[PDB]
Every structure is written in structure tokens, then in C-alpha cells.
Amino acid sequence: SMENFQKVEKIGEGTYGVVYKARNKLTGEVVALKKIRLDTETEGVPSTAIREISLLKELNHPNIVKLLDVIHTENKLYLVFEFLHQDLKKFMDASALTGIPLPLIKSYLFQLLQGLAFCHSHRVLHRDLKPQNLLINTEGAIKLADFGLARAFGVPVRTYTHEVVTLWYRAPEILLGCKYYSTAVDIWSLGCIFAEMVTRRALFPGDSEIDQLFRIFRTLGTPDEVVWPGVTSMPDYKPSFPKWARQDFSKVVPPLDEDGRSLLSQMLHYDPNKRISAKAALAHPFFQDVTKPVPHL
């Protein structure tokens, strides 16, 4: 089964198993091996794995991590994935003194939006976009990875799992406990990621859900009916929230040009209906001059 793979090193771990970097001894292909333990007397194959495999099997795009194989035993499941050098979180951290060049920011955002457009076009929500889940290689590519929290949706959407998206990257509609969420929650995350690439700092690092809303508000202004119809009719909304003004993105994200600022805000619109799609975002003037630089690794 796994006699052709040589383990090279551990590269991280999850809830149902560990990820190791490996090498096909016959082809030389360096891969990432996700081992998912099967609960063969209790719960069977984890639904997180059923979703990850079935959805990855369909999504074939240059900016989505490739699932190469699924190796079965009676007791284990091994997911064979392309190996990418590291994740965006590590990259940002490694770049915390030297800064990240803007062309690569723009390059990376563009690719992320291409990945994401493809998911949405294919009725898949990611629901866990954050730096740790975005993979880069040495040639200047970036890819959506970790589809364990992903979900195939219908049109229109219905009520899906609420406990979704890491807190910092979680859209306000989810925080305010709205009945329905959609593709916009992925865009919010990228919006946060966009900001974070530029400042190498989390845009909304909340220490709780109440604290998450407070952080968003002051930065974007406390939403009213005029900015977001329904915000006050939403559950979890409290008429008691302070009334903060919107800060100039010129202070929120100083390094950013007027186009960036403009794309950022459309990505961070309160109203999910007004928030820009990945598809529209691809057309934004920010990307007129996009290139594909290699990062300084």
C-alpha cells in the first residue's frame, strides 16, 4: 500500500491524524501524506474526511491543492497530496521584519480569488480560509488547502453548521447568528487575509465572539440599517453596541494604494449581499498589473 512512500518528516497534525512529508521511492514525487484513522468498531469514516475527499476529487484547479490519491486499508486511510513548501502563516511570520513585496501580495490575492471563484462556481464553500490553510511553493503559486470544513451547497442555500471558520476570519453574519450564510463568508475571510498580508498582522484578533464583533465595528463603523438592512433585526445583534465611526483604511492599511483599499472594503462589506464576489473581485482594477513573482524563501 504504502511501501512506495518513504516518510521524510512530520509537517503538522489534525483531529483524526498527522501529516507527514513523504517521497515516492519509484518516481521521486515529494508528497504530503494525511493519515486518517478509521473507527472500525464505532463511528466508521469521519464525515470530515468523506467531505474533504469527495469535494477535492471534483475540484481540479491550479490554485486548489491537488488530492493525488486515496490509499485504503481496513484500518487506515492515507490521503496523498501534492507537497507545497509551506503555508502563508509561516511565510508572513518569516517575512515579519523584511515585509512582503506588494506584487506578491497582489499575485497571491489574485490566485486565492481564482481558487475561490472555482469553488463557488462548483457549489463548494470552504469555510476555513485562514493563512495556515493556504499553501505556497517556491515558484510563486498559492493554493487553497484543508477542505475538511468544506461543504457542497445548494441554490438557494439552507441552514448549514454554525460553528465554522476560525474566529478571527469569521464573517459578521455568522457571529450575529444569522439563519443563512453563503459564499460571502469565504470572501470575508480573504478580506481579512488581504489585510493581514499587507500588515503581517491579524486584522481582527478577537479573544471571544463579543470581542470579535467589537473589533470589526470600531474598524468598519458600527453597522446601522442604512449600511446593512437587517443588522438590527438580526439575532445576537444588540441595540446596546457603541456607535463607532469607520476608520480611514489609510490608517488601517497604510501601505495600500487606493485600488487595494477599495477592493479591501468591498470584500469587508457588512451586508453579505453587497459584498463583492470572488468572480467580480477578479475584474477589480487592483489586478490590472498583476504579475507572478517568486517569493524570497
Partner: protein, 262 residues
Amino acid sequence: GVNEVPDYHEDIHTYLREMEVKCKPKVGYMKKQPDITNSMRAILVDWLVEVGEEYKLQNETLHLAVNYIDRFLSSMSVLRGKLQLVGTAAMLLASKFEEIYPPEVAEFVYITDDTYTKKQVLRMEHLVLKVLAFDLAAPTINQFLTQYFLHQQPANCKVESLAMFLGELSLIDADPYLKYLPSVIAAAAFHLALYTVTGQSWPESLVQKTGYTLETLKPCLLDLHQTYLRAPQHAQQSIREKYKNSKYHGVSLLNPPETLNV
């Protein structure tokens, strides 16, 4: 707005039409199954409907489980006494795919009257995954229905319920419905529900979306009308029971129209 995914509904629809070809069971597989009949499959599906009710599962989950079974039986011949095991495993897989809060495995063992062991259910789960190669994101009748509902003006509660009900009746009878694609059965179900309640036909907006006209939907309509008219007499009744309830507006108590005037 964004809940109806405007920038994506076309792309989505186009791909579901391509994917529903890929997940399509073999139309004639029952003739090739030596110990299994359309009758038995009917009894199985009818039971899954009940299971769906007892555990308050999504209808989408029921449609998925039937897709899983039909594909499994297109590739594997199964003895009658293990038919229910296939079905239980499919319902389990569909639940884990689709549901926020799937029932535990134990619950699925419970519903088979301990005809099977837990070990058997988990192992059949694995076998089903291998046979389908983990292609579980199958387009259903329901995925198409909910899309077609958007073209109503205004949206009619009774139409929605009635098209669901018709759609589920098709799940039961491999003959004839295995020869229709999901998107086709859905269109027929929606025409037939919309005609029965309001008097209107398949809108042109949907003719534009789908490329389907009443002409092309006629065969599937003829079958479905027939299934609708005969539904009180069918040996399986769980779906009629289900759609009597308040929740579905008692659509299954509505008298079917006697002609389709085409």
C-alpha cells in the same frame, strides 16, 4: 441576493447537469441483479423515507442515499438479505455528507431490527465508499427543484411542497424513473405541481435556463402523471403519509388533475 448566489447560479447549474450524467446509475441494472427486483428496491426506498422521518433528516439526504444505492447496485450484485445493509450504509453515508447532526452509527443499527451487526454496517460503509470511489456530491432532484423554484413569481408554498412530493415518488420506482436524469424528473415534478395548483405551465425563463421544453419533458411527464394518479394504490405509501402532514401543506391530499392538456 447572496443566498441565491447570483454570480454563480449559471455556472453551478451547468456543472450539476454535467455531474448528474456522471453519477447516473445504469438504467438496466435490475435485469442484471439475479436476487433483487424493482419491488424490493421500492420496499427499501420506502423504508428509507420512514427512516428519514423518524430521524428528521433532510429530504436531500434521502435523495443522496438512493443515488448511492442505485450506483452501488450498478456495479455490485447483492443478495436480497443484504439489500438492506447496502441501504443502511448509504443512508449513513448520505447523513454524514449532508447533515449538520447525522445520527450515530448505533442508531442505524437500531433501525434494521438488529438484522445486522454494527461491524457489518461500518464495513459496508467502507465498501460503498470504495465502489463509488468517494464521489458523493451527486446532483439530486432537490438540487434542481430549489433552483427552479426561484423562477416562480410569487413563490407558492403549495407548489414547492407538491413538486417535492412528486419528486420523491420517483425515488420509489426504478421503472420507469431510472431512465430520467434528476434535472428532467425535477422539471416534470415542477411543471406538474405548478399546473395542478395554479394552472400555469413550465415558464419560458426555465425553458431558457434548462433547454427543456414541454415537448422534451413529455415522456417523463406522462410517466409521472401516471405515478401521481396511481399513488393511492401504490404498494408503498410512506411518502403519501409524509406529505399529508401540516409541514408539507397536506399536498398529498390534493386531487391530481385528470389531463395535462398538451
